[PDB]
Amino acid sequence: DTALERQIASASRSVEEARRLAYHDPIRVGALVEQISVLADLRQKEGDFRKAESLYREALFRAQELRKQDPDLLTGIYSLLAHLYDRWGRMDKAAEFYELALKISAENGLEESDKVATIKNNLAMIFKQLRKFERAEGYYCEALETFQRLDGEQSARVASVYNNLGVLYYSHMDVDRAQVMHERALAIRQNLHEGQMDPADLSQTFINLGAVYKAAGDFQKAEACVDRAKRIRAAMNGYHPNPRRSASLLIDKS
16 A cells, blocks of 8 residues: 555556567567666665566566667666666675676777766776775776767766766865866856756765865865855755735644
8 A cells, every 4th residue: 555565566567568568579678678677676665676686687688689689788787787786785796787788888889878988987986985996087087088078068977977086086085186076067067057957966066175175275165165055955945935914824733
């Protein structure tokens, strides 16, 4: 009867439908993956990680059986398993599966793809957790260049990698390079207002700039940043005046 059980029933039917569809027409594998991602998400939320893993393995087996091999699809499926392992807390396995994704792409054309740049970013982050800074930096830079060539310099994805490098440099106390990265991220993030970027990312950049400036001994610019982040986080509640001529009806909240 619970909300999560309802979401699961719906997601299961939708997966079962995509399974049957791929029984009648074995080529429709991409759509099965999409439906699986939603159900796998829900299984993760309830902590059934083995069920989530089974779903992605099933997606993978279908992709592997295609008569025309689709490396891009396999790359994506491996990255979904990698992310699953990451949320599960199996950090080595997450790195291993992102690396498998990258190897499939490197062997076919897909070096400079959307998926690949994403994978390299996510893999770099796992390497940060593995405390392998040089490997993390390498992959972040590659993700950065690829997103630069794919999207403009002026894009959410470029600013995200800048941010991630910033935190990497900051965590290894390379304060100078952290600063450059977070400022480049700030520059981009200001120029992008609509639903192509939520304002909470902009607040993170100020927050991160704050810690960087404070580490640099510029406590002034530090507080200015921490202030502007607070202004942003406050401004996403929205002000709704209640103009009136008498008191509102009170609810006893005890």
